[PDB]
């Protein structure tokens, strides 16, 4: 009777059991194959990253390689959670604006390949909102491969008001790699990309005011931090710390014509019924690894406040567990009494087929 919750991200799989407070398994969403003259999945491929070429079956939150996605799900059930999938209801997650045909293929594979007894697919951002104890709010979900603004009213996303930025954590890593390369370091390989990811996570932050932070870094060493590389060389960064994530608010830093995440948040709220905007402004929930930066919630507060009506009460909620918010929300929902009627059963699939999932 124990359901499974699998939150499949562009970069990381978060998997576990409904009712747990954290995912049992968190591993890279990769399939690795030998570079030269048979497959490795997840942590397997990370170990052998040196000798493998890596594929990510999910791009910008959307499954694009179904052969390798099947390998991921098989690995999730059999090697990480160590379950027989035919014995467990399985809650899967999907990105906002996931194409309807993709949801159908997810459904077909769960029932026909893994013979699950029941399953469901929920939108990631909605689950994050639930995990914060809300059914109304606007979620900023930013992961490794995509960022979305998702306004939600009384339990349900408002699809017409969703906004999408094809920029998230991996882009920020790649930008810092570029900055550090121009300063004379060599960050090229897959393992080297991972070093820069770690630098980013450990030392980058979002400035409250970019211009004043730049002025400070130009006139003082007070913002410098150092990082010891694996070969023992020490790197010092100052304004690189906040120029990297500034890209979220200024996508032009990496050549992108898109609006920044503050403008997409505002534009999302402005797409919603005027009568519910007060509730959205007061319930901005941040979700995903790329919202983890120190300063990001305060900066969002400042930027939304500048855009919004004078008298508007604005609140940014940044849960400490938000690297895993989506998963936690799925764990709560899949263990909820009210949800047990909502599972798609094998018996319903066999009669209606994949279309059943809408």
Ligand X SMILES: Nc1ncnc2c1ncn2[C@@H]1O[C@H](COP(=O)(O)OP(=O)(O)OP(=O)(O)O)[C@@H](O)[C@H]1O
Ligand Y SMILES: CCN(C=O)/C=C/[C@@H](C)[C@@H](OC)[C@@H](C)[C@@H](CC[C@H](C)[C@H](C[C@H](OC(=O)CCCN)C(C)C)OC)OC(=O)[C@H]1CCCO1
Instruction: Kindly list the residues in this chain that would bind ligand Y in the complex (CB under 6 A).
Output: 122-123, 126, 130-131, 133-135, 155-156, 332-333, 336, 338-339
Residue 49 contact partner, candidates ligand X, ligand LAB, Ca ion, none, CB within 5 to 8 A by sort of partner: ligand LAB
Residue 126 contact partner, candidates ligand X, ligand LAB, ligand Y, none, CB within 5 to 8 A by sort of partner: ligand Y
DSSP 13-69: EEEEETT-SS-SEEEE--EEEES----EETHHHHHTTTTEEEE-SEETTEE--HHHH
Residue 9 contact partner, candidates ligand LAB, Ca ion, ligand Y, none, CB within 5 to 8 A by sort of partner: Ca ion
CB of 274 to ligand X, least distance (A): 30
The site string for ligand X over 12-31 (x = CB under 6 A, - otherwise) reads x-------------------
Cα pseudo-dihedral 169, 175, 176, 181, rounded to 10: 150
Closest CA to 148 of 132, 134, 167, 129: 167
Closest CA to 271 of 143, 130, 157, 146: 157
Q: Which helix (H) or strand (E) holds 248?
A: helix 240-249
Residue 193 contact partner, candidates Ca ion, ligand X, ligand LAB, none, CB within 5 to 8 A by sort of partner: ligand LAB
The site string for ligand X over 253-292 (x = CB under 6 A, - otherwise) reads -----------------------------------xxx-x
Q: What residue number has its CB nearest to ligand Y?
A: 155
Spatial distance between the Cα atoms of 276 and 158, rounded to a whole number of angstroms: 12
The site string for Ca ion over 126-145 (x = CB under 5 A, - otherwise) reads -----------------x--
Neighbours of 336 (CB within 10 A): 13
- Total H helices, total E strands in the chain: 13, 19
Q: Which helix (H) or strand (E) holds 12?
A: strand 12-17
Spatial distance between the Cα atoms of 146 and 150, rounded to a whole number of angstroms: 13
Spatial distance between the Cα atoms of 152 and 126, rounded to a whole number of angstroms: 7
Residue 314 contact partner, candidates ligand LAB, Ca ion, ligand X, none, CB within 5 to 8 A by sort of partner: none
Give the interface size with ligand X as a residue count (CB under 6 A): 21
- Which parts of 196-225 interact with ligand X (CB under 6 A)? 197, 200-201
Spatial distance between the Cα atoms of 132 and 208, rounded to a whole number of angstroms: 25
Nearer to ligand X, 118 or 162 (CB): 162
Question: Are 200 and 173 in contact, with CB atoms under 8 Å apart?
Answer: yes
Nearer to ligand LAB, 262 or 323 (CB): 323
Among 145, 238, 329, 354, interactor with ligand X by CB under 6 A: 145
Among 3, 6, 11, 57, interactor with ligand X by CB under 6 A: 11
Which residue ranges make up the site for ligand LAB (CB under 6 A)?
Answer: 11-12, 28, 30, 46, 49, 54, 144, 169-170, 173, 190, 193-194, 197
CB of 89 to ligand X, least distance (A): 22
């Amino acid at each position: 009777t124990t359901a499974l919750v699998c939150d499949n991200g562009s970069g990381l799989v978060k998997a576990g059991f409904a009712g747990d407070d954290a995912p049992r398994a968190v591993f890279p969403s990769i399939v690795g194959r030998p570079r030269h003259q048979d497959s490795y999945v997840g942590d397997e491929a990370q170990s052998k990253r040196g000798i493998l070429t890596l594929k990510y079956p999910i791009e910008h939150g959307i499954i694009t390689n179904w052969d390798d996605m099947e390998k991921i799900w098989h690995h999730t059930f059999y090697n990480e959670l160590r379950v027989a999938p035919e014995e467990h209801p399985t809650l899967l997650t999907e990105a906002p604006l996931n194409p309807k045909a993709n949801r159908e293929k997810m459904t077909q594979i769960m029932f026909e390949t893994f013979n699950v007894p029941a399953m469901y697919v929920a939108i990631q951002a909605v689950l994050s909102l639930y995990a914060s104890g809300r059914t109304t709010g606007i979620v900023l979900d930013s992961g490794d491969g995509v960022t979305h603004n998702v306004p939600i009213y009384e339990g349900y996303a408002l699809p017409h008001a969703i906004m999408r930025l094809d920029l998230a954590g991996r882009d920020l890593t790649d930008y810092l790699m570029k900055i550090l390369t121009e300063r004379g370091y060599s960050f090229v390989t897959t393992a080297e990309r991972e070093i820069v990811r770690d630098i980013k996570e450990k030392l980058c932050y979002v400035a409250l005011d970019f211009e004043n932070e730049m002025a400070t870094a130009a006139s003082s060493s007070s913002l410098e931090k150092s990082y010891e590389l694996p070969d023992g060389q020490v790197i010092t960064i100052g304004n690189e710390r906040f120029r990297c994530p500034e890209t979220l608010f200024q996508p032009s830093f990496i050549g992108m014509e898109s609006a920044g995440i503050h403008e997409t948040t505002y534009n999302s709220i402005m797409k919603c019924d005027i009568d519910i905007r007060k509730d959205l402004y007061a319930n901005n929930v941040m979700s995903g690894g790329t919202t983890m930066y120190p300063g990001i919630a305060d900066r969002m507060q400042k930027e939304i406040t500048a855009l919004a009506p004078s008298t508007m009460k604005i609140k940014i909620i940044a849960p400490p567990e938000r690297k895993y918010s989506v998963w936690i929300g799925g764990s709560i929902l899949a263990s909820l009494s009210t949800f047990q009627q909502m599972w798609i059963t094998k018996q319903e699939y066999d009669e209606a087929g994949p279309s059943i999932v809408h």
